[PDB]
Design an enzyme around this catalytic site. Structure first.
Site, PDB file in Angstrom:
ATOM      1  N   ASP A 346       0.600  -1.157   0.034  1.00  0.00           N
ATOM      2  CA  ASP A 346      -0.119  -0.295  -0.269  1.00  0.00           C
ATOM      3  C   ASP A 346       0.980   0.712  -0.347  1.00  0.00           C
ATOM      4  OD1 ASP A 346      -2.510  -1.510   0.659  1.00  0.00           O
ATOM      5  OD2 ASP A 346      -1.686  -1.786   2.426  1.00  0.00           O
ATOM      6  N   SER A 371       1.843   6.684   0.155  1.00  0.00           N
ATOM      7  CA  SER A 371       1.264   5.956   0.843  1.00  0.00           C
ATOM      8  C   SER A 371      -0.372   6.414   0.373  1.00  0.00           C
ATOM      9  CB  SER A 371       1.423   6.253   2.669  1.00  0.00           C
ATOM     10  OG  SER A 371       0.830   5.404   3.160  1.00  0.00           O
ATOM     11  N   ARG A 372      -0.278   5.130  -0.031  1.00  0.00           N
ATOM     12  CA  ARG A 372      -1.867   5.324  -0.764  1.00  0.00           C
ATOM     13  C   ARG A 372      -3.049   5.358   0.372  1.00  0.00           C
ATOM     14  NH1 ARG A 372      -1.897   3.519  -6.205  1.00  0.00           N
ATOM     15  NH2 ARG A 372      -4.192   2.613  -5.723  1.00  0.00           N
ATOM     16  N   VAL A 373      -2.364   5.262   1.970  1.00  0.00           N
ATOM     17  CA  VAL A 373      -3.710   5.543   2.954  1.00  0.00           C
ATOM     18  C   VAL A 373      -3.678   7.040   2.925  1.00  0.00           C
ATOM     19  CG1 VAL A 373      -4.349   5.118   4.564  1.00  0.00           C
ATOM     20  CG2 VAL A 373      -3.196   2.905   3.600  1.00  0.00           C
TER      21      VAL A 373
ATOM     22  N   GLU B 190      -7.660  -2.516  -1.340  1.00  0.00           N
ATOM     23  CA  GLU B 190      -8.597  -1.250  -1.918  1.00  0.00           C
ATOM     24  C   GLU B 190     -10.220  -1.651  -2.813  1.00  0.00           C
ATOM     25  OE1 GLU B 190      -5.848   0.657  -4.792  1.00  0.00           O
ATOM     26  OE2 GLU B 190      -4.312   0.541  -3.230  1.00  0.00           O
TER      27      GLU B 190
END
Ligand SMILES: Nc1ncnc2c1ncn2[C@@H]1O[C@H](COP(=O)(O)OP(=O)(O)OP(=O)(O)O)[C@@H](O)[C@H]1O
Ligand SMILES: [Mg+2]
Lengths: 517, 469, 47, 122, 50
Positions: A346, A371-373, B190
């Protein structure tokens, strides 16, 4: 003080309680054996991944099944395998003992202690290949998992249930980042609250035993072994242990995640686990591909990293946060295993040797790290003081070519240059010195509010250190209510500015000058 | 009787022996039960090769852990079949057709095989048609193709999910169509986030989700795109409905194909991709097309390995793509939504013979102005706008106005703000950007251009800040 | 003259970076293909 | 063999052994000269699949225990000056201090030809 | 090897010899040809293990 008759009566009650009644068992025979692999005729009822018992207490894993023999990987003491030995079934797939007795211990990739501190009492056993939480059994990543590193917590925030790859060449600080993350949970553990406590699992794959001992010593010096388990597959272990070690460390800490607890797991150099699986697969004569890898090595790592999850409230709300480590060669993130793990996780923290040598430590490339969060893994105070940080650093990187031409720059551009220099000096941090989130908020406030524009670049570290010391000693209310309220209200910001001004008029720069604006 | 038995298990690859007159056809789905209580399940095996001597080699879709030699293997007599119909809207499936959010749902629907042929040569459209979406930047600078393929090049924090929601809305409302999302190599986090966001935007009822996730063997990740495309083909052909297909990282389909080819022992190709890379990519991309008046259009995310566009996987994917939309973070930071990079995005039908002469001239003038502004942006940043020339400053103002007018109020934003989304016709967009290129709005403040529709919204937004035409 | 010459040198370095990156990607692909050829040659020699 | 002599001096005599191994890499290289003749499918760069496992079962005996010191010093050949070669790249993880010599430093006439930016010590 | 034996006979009688192997690369390539024709498994650049 020796418990003499304790030992006596213990082995006595064992030997009295020994009634091994004889029953049938389906057996096979070793036909060939070499390089850690053994082929076994017979065993028609053996299943894939079934544990096998070779004479002398030796364990194997049935991986290849065909009409002639069973190709098994030996888990240790392979030089004792001989053609003609009798192999027995266990009727079980690889499982591991789980429970809270593993906190503070160093075990095998089998649940067996290697620290010599006695037996580990286990709640139950857990299979190594139990499936991951479903797509409907999960929850959004919402709670922060504080690493204590300002660069990560401000730029690439990690949440409870997220996977943040730590990827770098070598001697770039990956183990240091992960050990600081582990040490930062000491206050959470001290709070006693199961909603805030984080249990840690450190998996060491293919490391020198003295390096594992040094990691354990670093964790003991910081009180981090009260809540940490180490799964060690040293460099001298078989390829089967190096292949199974992350699955063992993940079977433990899934027993905790499914009990409503929050866990952090570190897979130190998954690259070595992929290399061990490649060795096993080439010795089993499975078709190779790019870099001779089996062809299900992406599956090998994604199956492991998709078990780190944030569970739904119906399942208890537990979480497992993964910090896999990847070593690259010559900063080649387009290699096979780096590409795979970058695809799976992620977010990524990229560590460079050049940045390390320039003094930027931790050597995180904030430009490419991601960070994709994102801001969903930050408290509001950190989300507010660090929102103006990324654009500032990008502007500084764009303007770095005009360092010796400040007079030839717009006033705004020279301001951006000085602010960026201060912010680059602000994101530096010593080894094994994680900061609580309130202090990181105060530090990034010092940075982005402008209170460092008057301090020399070469004094920013000392200024931040001494100001945090002052606030820890004198003004504990600011930090305390930042920690309690998770935000920085306007009155807290006002008191913070007042304290900063008083400290500035007290602070003494290295050039003799004054840091007063 | 006519059932087979497992002979070999080597990872995801299973060899099965059948009676002499019961060999299953290629791509058939076989069932074999794993009875170990910890790992008890039903493996689905897709026949991959006929080895001879009544042996077939199959790729398993589930992990084969716990599988024993000799167990019974049942031939279903058909390939992998997914449920088709209106009932698949608002629900999540895997590449096998099993409902994830409600297990057992869709078992009584009609089931379609996922291996289908593209439309016959006499059914194909010999004329390229533009898809009028309603977004100004898309309709003007990178017009989409009806039945064509659009690459999407946006990451995290640039509004890719918002753009997916927007296209779902626009296909459901402006065309009376349906959406099918294919998560190929989807991250389960996701995937759950997409599920929850679509349910909270109330667009899930318009979308069918098919997730083949990362923690699955390569066969499922290789067949999930065909499953989603089969649902889309039912919606196009049997329902008579324009479909919008979303393929998650089409590259992961290529990668799963390469992994399956490596597991089957096939000799690798250049760089390493499976020898039949182009054949598999074509077999997939040729079913996405217009036929009999209805069409399937596809927005596909494309990963480029090592940023090398000459890499075989992007080079084979781009042989089928019709447009490109790159979502930029520099545009997202300026507050322009959708964050479409006007200079990096493109379309193959931005041609005077497809869109017309005035469309082409206006789009090229806009692109010229934006490229000149891009050139001047660094001089502005390091030195300052005060240093520029007079025509330079004038062009900077006009280009900021054009930039902000490329933005729009999207239908995916009605959930937060509450005001509906715009559907600007192509003619109105051409005329508005012609006027903006002339300079008819260089006295209007910049903020009057943010997130509006056509020219009427522009006038009513301008006079709210105290500015007339 | 210095401004014009530096703009020219910037464009030239851009074009050189582009050509060098094309050559580097060609060499990367060729290295992967050659390594796979050697691995598969050994595996086919042993089969 | 030399490791067994040093291990006797460590575990039985118990006094401060010094172990020098000139080109431990050759050990690894020897294992790759017989690999395909032993019927092993080759690994990435022509090395045996058991590269790291054999290197680990050898390098983990070269160590000090508690109270029993062995100061070890090994020469590691870097094939074709490529530090990303699998053999030195997996040798790197078994060491407390590494002095890395560059041919770029050698060509400038600087001796010892140590690369100061690539070398390390724990 | 022939030239080296001819030279070693002289070396072992107290005489000093100088041998020049012009393009040992061609000799390595001839060994590679021989080994690939005997169907021994190749290594890097198809060279044998030895
Ligand atoms: N933040 C830091 N500040 C100062 N020194 C650091 C920092 N982080 C790491 N170091 C130093 O860098 C050296 C190497 O770091 P570390 O061992 O953590 O890297 P690594 O990624 O584990 O590399 P390898 O696995 O190859 O040893 C250590 O000796 C440590 O003292
Ligand atoms: Mg390390």
């Amino acid at each position: 003080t020796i418990p003499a008759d304790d030992i006596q009566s213990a082995i006595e009650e064992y030997v009295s309680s020994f009634t091994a009644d004889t029953s049938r068992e389906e057996v096979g025979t070793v036909v060939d054996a070499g390089d850690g692999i053994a082929h076994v005729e017979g065993l028609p009822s053996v299943m894939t991944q079934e544990l096998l018992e070779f004479p002398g207490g030796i364990l194997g894993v049935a991986l290849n099944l065909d009409e002639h023999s069973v190709g098994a990987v030996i888990l240790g003491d392979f030089e004792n395998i001989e053609e003609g030995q009798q192999v027995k079934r266990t009727g079980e797939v690889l499982s591991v003992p789980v429970g809270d007795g593993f906190l503070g211990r160093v075990v095998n990739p089998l649940g067996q202690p290697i620290d010599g501190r006695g037996d580990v009492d286990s709640d139950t056993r857990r299979a190594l290949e139990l499936q991951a939480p479903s797509v409907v059994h999960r929850q959004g990543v919402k709670e922060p998992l504080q690493t204590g590193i300002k660069a990560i917590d401000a730029m690439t925030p990690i949440g409870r249930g997220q996977r943040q790859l730590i990827i770098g060449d070598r001697k770039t600080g990956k183990t240091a980042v992960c050990v600081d993350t582990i040490l930062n949970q000491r206050q959470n553990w001290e709070s006693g609250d199961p909603k805030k406590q984080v249990r840690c699992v450190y998996v060491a794959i293919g490391q020198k035993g003295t390096t594992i001992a040094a990691v354990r010593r670093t964790l003991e010096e910081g009180g981090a072994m009260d809540y940490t388990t180490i799964v060690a597959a040293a460099a001298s272990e078989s390829a089967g242990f190096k292949w199974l070690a992350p699955y063992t460390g993940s079977a433990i800490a899934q027993h905790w995640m499914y009990e409503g607890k929050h866990v952090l797991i570190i897979f130190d150099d998954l690259t070595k686990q992929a290399e061990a699986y490649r060795a096993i697969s080439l010795l089993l004569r499975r078709p190779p591909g790019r870099e001779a890898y089996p062809g299900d090595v992406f599956y090998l790592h994604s199956r492991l990293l998709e078990r780190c999850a944030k569970l739904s409230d119906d399942l208890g709300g537990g979480s497992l946060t993964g910090l896999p480590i990847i070593e690259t060669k010559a900063n080649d993130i387009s290699a096979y295993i780096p590409t795979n793990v970058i695809s799976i996780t992620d977010g990524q923290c990229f560590l460079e040797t050049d940045l390390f040598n320039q003094g930027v430590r931790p050597a995180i490339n904030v430009g490419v790290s991601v960070s994709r969060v994102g801001g969903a893994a930050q408290i509001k105070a950190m989300k507010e003081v660090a929102g103006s940080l990324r654009l500032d650093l990008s502007q500084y990187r764009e303007l770095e070519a005009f360092a010796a031409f400040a007079s030839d720059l717009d006033a705004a551009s020279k301001a951006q240059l000085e602010r960026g220099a201060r912010l680059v000096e602000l994101l530096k941090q010593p080894q094994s010195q994680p900061m609580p989130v309130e202090e990181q908020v105060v530090s990034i406030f010092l940075g982005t509010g402008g209170h460092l524009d008057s301090v020399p670049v070469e004094d920013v570290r000392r200024f931040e250190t001494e100001l945090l010391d002052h606030m820890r000693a004198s003004e504990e209310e600011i930090l305390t209510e930042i920690r309690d309220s998770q935000k920085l209200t306007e009155e807290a910001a006002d008191k913070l500015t007042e304290v900063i001004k008083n400290f500035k008029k007290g602070f003494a720069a290295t050039g003799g000058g004054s840091v007063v604006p | 009787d006519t059932s087979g038995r497992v002979v070999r298990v080597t990872g995801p690859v299973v060899d099965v022996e059948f009676p002499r007159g019961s060999i299953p056809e290629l791509f058939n789905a076989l069932h074999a039960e794993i009875t170990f209580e910890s790992l008890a399940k039903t493996l689905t095996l897709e026949v991959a090769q006929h080895l001879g001597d009544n042996l077939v080699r199959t790729i398993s879709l589930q992990p084969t852990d716990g599988l024993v030699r000799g167990v019974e293997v049942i031939d279903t007599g058909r390939s992998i079949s997914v449920p088709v119909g209106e009932g698949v809207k608002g629900h999540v499936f895997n590449a096998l057709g099993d409902c994830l959010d409600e297990p057992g749902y869709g078992e009584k629907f009609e089931h379609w095989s996922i291996h289908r042929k593209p439309p016959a040569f006499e059914e194909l459209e010999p004329r390229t048609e533009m898809l009028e979406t309603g977004l100004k930047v898309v309709d003007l600078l990178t017009p989409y193709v009806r039945g064509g393929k659009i690459a999407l090049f946006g990451g995290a924090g640039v509004g890719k999910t918002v753009l997916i929601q927007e296209m779902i809305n626009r296909i459901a409302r402006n065309f009376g169509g349906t959406s099918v999302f294919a998560g190929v190599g989807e991250r389960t986090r996701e995937g759950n986030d997409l599920w929850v966001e679509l349910a909270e935007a109330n667009v899930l009822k318009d979308t069918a989700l098919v997730f083949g996730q990362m923690d699955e063997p390569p066969g499922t990740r290789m067949r999930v795109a065909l499953s989603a495309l089969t649902m889309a083909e039912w919606f196009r052909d049997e329902q008579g409905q324009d479909v919008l297909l979303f393929i998650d990282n089409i590259f992961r389909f290529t990668q799963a194909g390469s992994e399956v080819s490596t597991l089957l022992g096939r000799m690798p190709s250049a760089v390493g991709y499976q020898p039949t890379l182009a054949d598999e990519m074509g077999e997939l991309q040729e079913r996405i097309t217009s036929t009999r008046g209805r069409s399937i259009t596809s927005m596909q995310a494309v990963y480029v390995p090592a940023d090398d566009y000459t890499d075989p996987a992007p080079a084979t994917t781009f042989a089928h793509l019709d447009a490109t939309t790159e979502l930029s973070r520099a545009v997202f930071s300026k507050g322009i939504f959708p964050a479409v990079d006007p200079l990096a995005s493109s379309s193959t039908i931005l041609d005077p013979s497809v869109v017309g002469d005035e469309h082409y001239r206006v789009a090229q003038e806009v692109i010229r102005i934006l490229q000149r502004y891009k050139d001047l942006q660094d001089i502005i940043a390091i030195l300052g706008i005060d240093e520029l020339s007079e025509e330079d400053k004038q062009l900077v103002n006009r280009a900021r106005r054009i930039e902000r007018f490329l933005s729009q109020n999207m239908m995916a934003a009605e959930q937060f703000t509450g005001q509906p989304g715009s559907t600007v016709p192509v003619k109105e967009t051409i005329e508005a950007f012609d006027r903006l290129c002339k300079g008819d709005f260089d006295h209007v403040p910049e903020q009057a251009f943010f997130l509006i529709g056509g020219l009427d919204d522009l006038a009513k937004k301008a006079e709210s800040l105290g500015a007339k035409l | 003259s210095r401004q014009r010459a530096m703009k020219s040198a910037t464009d030239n370095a851009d074009d050189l970076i582009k050509a060098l990156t094309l050559m580097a990607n060609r060499e990367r692909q060729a290295q992967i293909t050659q390594e796979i050829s050697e691995i598969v040659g050994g595996a086919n020699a042993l089969a």
